[PDB]
C-alpha cells in the first residue's frame, strides 16, 4: 500500500531521499557544465542537458514544498561526496571518459531507478513531475553512451578504471539510502536491479562484451 504521506515518520525519511534527489540535480547540471570545458565543441548541447537538470531540481523542490519538508541538504551533500570528490579530481586531470561514466553512466543510471522505483509509491503531486522527469534521463544516458561510444578504443582501460573506483561507491549509497527508501517503501532489491540494467544496456551500447560486463558488475564487490 503507499505511504502515509502525512505521518511524521515518512516526512522524516523525505526530507533525506527528497534533498539526494535535489543535491543530485544540482549535481548534474554543475557536471554537466564542468564537462563542457574539456568539450569546447560540446558546450551547446550540454548547456540544454544542464538546464534540463535544474527543471529537474525545480521540480523537486516543489514536491518538497508540496508535502511541507525541508530537504536535509547536509545529508545529501556528505551522501554526493564520495562520486563528487572522484568527478573533480577526473575532471582537474583533464580525464572525460571517466567525468562521462561517472555523471552520464553510473548518476544517471542510479537516478533512472531511484525515480523509477519511487513513481509508484510516490504522493500524487511528486508522481507527475518524477513521470516527466524519468524520461528525461535516458537522453542524458544516450548522450554518454554516444561519446564515449565514439570514442571506445581510445578509452577502454580509463573506463575500466573508473568503473573500478567509482561504482564501489554507487553500492555504498544504495546501501545508505536503503533505510530512509523503505520508509518510502521503495524496495532495496528493486533499486538495485533497475540500477544495474540501466547500467549494463549502457555499457553494451557503448561496445563492451558480455564477459568485460560481466568483469565490469562484479567490482561492485
Ligand atoms: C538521485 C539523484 C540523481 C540525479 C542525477 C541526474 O539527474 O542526472
Ligand atoms: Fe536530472
Ligand atoms: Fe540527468
Redesign the pocket.
Known amino acids: 500500500a503507499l505511504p502515509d504521506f502525512t505521518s511524521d515518520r515518512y516526512k522524516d525519511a523525505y526530507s533525506r531521499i527528497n534533498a ?2 535535489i ?3 544540482q ?2 547540471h554543475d557536471n554537466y557544465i564542468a564537462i563542457g570545458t574539456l568539450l569546447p565543441d560540446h558546450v551547446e548541447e550540454l548547456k540544454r542537458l544542464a538546464k534540463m ?1 535544474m527543471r ?1 531540481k525545480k521540480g523537486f523542490t516543489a514536491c518538497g514544498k508540496n508535502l511541507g519538508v525541508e530537504a536535509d541538504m547536509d545529508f545529501a551533500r556528505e551522501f554526493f561526496a564520495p562520486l563528487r570528490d572522484n568527478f573533480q579530481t577526473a575532471l582537474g586531470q583533464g580525464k572525460t571518459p571517466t567525468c562521462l561514466l561517472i ?1 552520464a553512466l553510473l ?2 543510471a ?2 533512472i531507478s ?2 523509477h522505483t519511487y513513481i509508484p509509491v510516490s504522493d500524487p503531486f511528486a508522481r507527475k513531475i518524477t513521470e516527466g ?1 524519468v524520461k528525461d ?1 535516458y537522453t ?1 544516458l544516450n548522450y554518454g553512451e554516444a561519446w564515449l561510444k565514439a570514442n571506445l578504443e581510445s578509452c577502454r582501460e580509463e573506463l575500466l578504471e573508473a568503473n573500478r573506483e567509482n561504482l564501489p561507491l554507487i553500492r555504498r549509497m544504495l546501501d545508505q539510502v536503503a533505510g530512509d527508501a523503505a520508509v518510502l517503501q521503495m524496495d532495496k532489491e528493486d533499486l538495485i536491479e533497475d540500477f544495474l540494467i540501466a547500467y549494463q544496456e549502457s555499457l553494451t551500447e557503448i561496445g563492451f562484451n558480455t564477459r568485460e560486463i560481466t568483469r565490469m558488475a562484479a567490482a561492485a564487490l
Open positions: 539526494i534527489y543535491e543530485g540535480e549535481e548534474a537538470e529537474h555523471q548518476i544517471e542510479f537516478a531511484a525515480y522527469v534521463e542524458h
